[PDB]
């Protein structure tokens, strides 16, 4: 019965910055991992940026060092700070929660699109 919800996508210049917002109707300490993944239509969905609720974060090899993801307990929402983009960013980011208490949830996404103009 859980609910994710993605915000803060939309257009950026190359090497700009957005983050993202995933705000969760449970208390987030009660998901076991929360994970971004993204994926471009046409191409396989790809895990971006993963958070347990110990606080490990791991991070794909292509985001390491730009992408930051982040509990924020207070406002019940995890972000991903997402710096540097390029076009190899563009896609629609996923928010996924894992409850091991075994199941999945995810959200509707948000779409990125990295274009210079």
């Known amino acids: 019965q859980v609910k994710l919800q993605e915000s803060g996508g939309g257009l950026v210049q190359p090497g700009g910055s957005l983050r993202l917002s995933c705000a969760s109707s449970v208390p987030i300490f009660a998901i076991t991992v929360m994970g971004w993944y993204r994926q471009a239509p046409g191409k396989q969905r790809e895990l971006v940026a993963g958070i347990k609720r110990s606080g490990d974060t791991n991070y794909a090899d292509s985001v390491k060092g730009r992408f930051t993801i982040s509990r924020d307990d207070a406002k019940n929402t995890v972000f991903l700070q997402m710096n540097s983009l390029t076009t190899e960013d563009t896609a629609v980011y996923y928010c996924?929660?894992?409850?091991?208490?075994?199941?999945?949830?995810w959200g509707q996404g948000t779409q990125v699109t990295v274009s210079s103009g």
């Open positions: 996924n929660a894992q409850i091991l208490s075994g199941t999945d949830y």
